[PDB]
Structures are given as structure tokens and as C-alpha cells.
Symmetry: C2
Subunit: 231 residues, 2 copies
């Protein structure tokens, strides 16, 4: 496919810088791992350098690199066609019965590696709700995303749902509703996608020997040509 896709052969380091503010509580996070797009794998470790995180780690997972997705020859790959100059990624995330997050990322290739530099602002949460009351499990369900093209901006649009399990229930979930849009940083030719889906499977872990608040993960991510494979 694209000449940007040349940069993703083999395993490549991944570096994350996040700044956050949820109803007055501020915090910074740093992450380090790798991605291998030939199989759609991402493996990474995260630490909060400022103190404790003010919300459950699972609500931050979607904001903490769709360029590592396994894309076959039959679909256009927007994310890698933008590389190395990169893309801006923006979301609004709205919690069932509670507040919302707004996010803005720059995702680029620099110095042999992928950088995700992202800012998060949270507003309108209940002080006794599941979020600010830290009442959600340290785990994660499999998801399916919807993706299509915006020919007017030579970009990408996406809409999906994410489920979070309630601490002290078993099989009761709230929903975080996701809307998203992506725009190129450079002015050069890119690949604008057509309608398709993307599967995610995430597993979370921790390390008790590190005294800082922490989280690790492993994920598998594939593009799905659903106009053909759901027949």
C-alpha cells in the first residue's frame, strides 16, 4: 500500500506523554512499550509521575495508536498513509448518567518510534458516581469500532461504544459513548478510507514492586472488511 507503511516492518518503540484535569484534580502520565503491525500487537507500561490517578485506570485506556492495527491488502490504511508527518486525533467521551471527557492528540513518527502526545479535560461528574467514587473493575471487555471517510477534509470519522464493569456486581455494565475525528498534519497525498470495522481485545495487569501508581497492557487489533466477512 502506502510508502508510510514502510516504517512499520518489525517491532517499533512506542512513547506516550499525557496531561490531564478532571473537575480540578490534575495529573501527568508517561508510557513506554512497542508495536508490531504485522500481527496487530501493542504491549506497554504506564506510570503516574505526580501521585495517584483521580479516576479508574480503565476509563483512560482508549486515550492512552491505531497505526499499529493489522491492515490487509484489500482495505485503505489512513493511519500509516499519513506517516511520518502524522495526524491529529480528537474525541468526545460521554458517561451514562455522569460527566464527559474531551481529548486532543498529535500522533507522529520520530526518531525510529511512534509518539502519542495527548491532553484530556473532564467536566460535570457526580462526586458520588462510579467514576469519581472509583467504583469500576480493573479489567476490560472486547470491542468493535465503526470507521468511515470524510472526503471534504481528506480525513477519517468513527463512532463506537465501550463497556466498564461495576465493582461488586457480576455482569452489570455502564457505557462510555465515543465520537471521533482524524485530520492529517502534512499536506501531501493520503489514503481516505471506505466503511469498515476494527476488532479490539485488551488485557490489563499491575506491578506491586513499583511504588508509583501503575498499569500494563497487551492488545490485539485488526481491521475487518465487514461488507464481505459478515455474509
Amino acid at each position: 500500500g502506502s510508502s508510510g507503511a514502510l516504517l512499520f516492518h518489525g517491532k517499533i518503540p512506542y512513547v506516550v506523554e499525557m496531561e490531564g484535569n478532571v473537575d480540578g484534580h490534575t495529573f501527568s502520565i508517561r508510557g513506554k512499550g512497542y508495536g508490531d503491525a504485522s500481527v496487530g500487537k501493542v504491549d506497554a507500561q504506564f506510570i503516574c509521575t505526580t501521585g495517584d490517578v483521580p479516576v479508574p485506570w480503565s476509563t483512560l485506556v482508549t486515550t492512552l495508536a491505531q497505526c499499529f492495527a493489522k491492515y490487509g491488502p484489500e482495505l485503505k490504511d489512513f493511519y500509516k498513509s499519513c506517516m511520518p508527518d502524522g495526524y491529529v486525533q480528537e474525541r468526545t467521551i460521554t458517561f451514562e448518567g455522569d460527566g464527559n471527557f474531551k481529548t486532543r492528540a498529535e500522533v507522529t513518527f520520530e526518531n525510529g518510534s511512534v509518539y502519542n502526545r495527548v491532553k484530556l479535560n473532564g467536566q460535570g461528574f457526580k462526586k458520588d458516581g462510579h467514576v469519581l467514587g472509583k467504583n469500576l473493575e480493573f479489567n476490560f471487555t472486547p470491542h468493535c469500532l465503526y470507521i468511515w471517510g470524510d472526503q471534504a477534509n481528506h480525513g477519517l470519522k468513527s463512532a463506537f461504544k465501550i463497556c466498564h464493569e461495576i465493582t461488586g456486581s457480576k455482569g452489570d455494565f455502564i457505557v462510555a459513548d465515543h465520537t471521533q475525528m482524524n485530520t492529517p498534519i502534512g499536506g501531501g497525498p493520503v489514503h481516505v478510507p471506505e466503511y469498515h470495522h476494527m476488532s479490539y481485545h485488551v488485557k490489563l495487569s499491575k506491578d506491586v514492586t513499583d511504588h508509583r501508581d501503575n498499569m500494563s497492557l497487551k492488545e490485539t487489533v485488526r481491521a475487518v472488511d465487514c461488507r464481505k466477512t459478515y455474509d
Copy 2:
């Protein structure tokens, strides 16, 4: 396995009884076809008896039988487990920047035929919007549903998105946000579900010899064990 499921071998006939009211306009639709649950397929033809539908046909498809889905041995099949007595299925459907549908349906097994009898009420639409203005294509995309358990009430919960393409844009979509709850009608024992997904692929047609406002469809539907398949 469950006693309901044996009612489903081979082609089983399907009847639909639907009434609507969207801001001033009452209307009725009657449908007939069959479903074959061993391959997950459904065929059916629809007529509007009162005149022309006052919203585009695409917006009505999800309201117009999840008992015809292909379930393999590895997952609990709630819909089939309820039969022959049936279940109640209620939804709220909220359209991006416009109004909403509330629907209440009863789904039963009677004389070797499945019956879907359903009521729909619509409120808060704009006269110049894509819905009341009728400005959406006569076509459909593949979708993916999330399904889980509500043990407390021996019931089922579901949440998901549906895309509708805007006429005269090309490639741009509006989203219809769906929430759903199902409750057994009878008293027998049933299979409460666990977290899984369900795939859909739908194709619309017309019978152009016929003078009444009309629509046909064919569909493939299957349950998905995502905790293993997404790995």
C-alpha cells in the same frame, strides 16, 4: 441446550404486525416471510396498507426477530430458550441532532409460525431534518451488536449503533443510537446470557410491479464469542 430450540429446525414461517405514530401521522405495515436459524438467514416482504410511510424505510428496519440468529453450542441462546411462550422487547432509538422512537414488541411461537407484533411512537423531529424531509438512501450497512445478562430479572440487555447514509452527500452518515431490554412472557426456566456480540448483514429491494409503497430484505445474522475470537 433448551426445549425452545427444537422448535427451530428448517425453514419456519414469519408474520409481522406493525402500527406507527410519528408526530401527527398514523400508519400500518404488514409483513410475511420465513427464517432458517441453522444458517441464520431471514427473507421477508413488507407493504404499507395506509399509504406512503412518512419516514424513510431504512429507519424502520431494526423495529421490523433475534430468535432466527445462528447460535453454536458454546453460548447461551436466550431468545430461543423463551419459546414457545415468547418475550417482550423494548427500545429507545435517538437520532443524531433530531428526534426519537420508543418501541414495544411481543414475539411469540403460534401454530408453527413466529409472530412479531409491535408498536412505535415518534416525538421531537424537525420538518426540514433528514428524517421527516426524507433525505436518506434506500440501502444499509453491516452492524455489530453488544449483548449481556440481567440476572436480577431473568432478562437480557443490549446497546449499539446503526448508520444511515445521507442522500446527496456521498459517504457521509447519520447515527441512530439504540438501547434495548428483553423480558420473558411465560413462567418456565430460561438461559440468562453472558457478554458476547452479534453480527448483521442486510440487503434491501423493491417489487416494482406493485403500486403500493413497499420494501423487501434478506439478512444473515450470527452470534460471536468475542472473548476467544478477537485474540
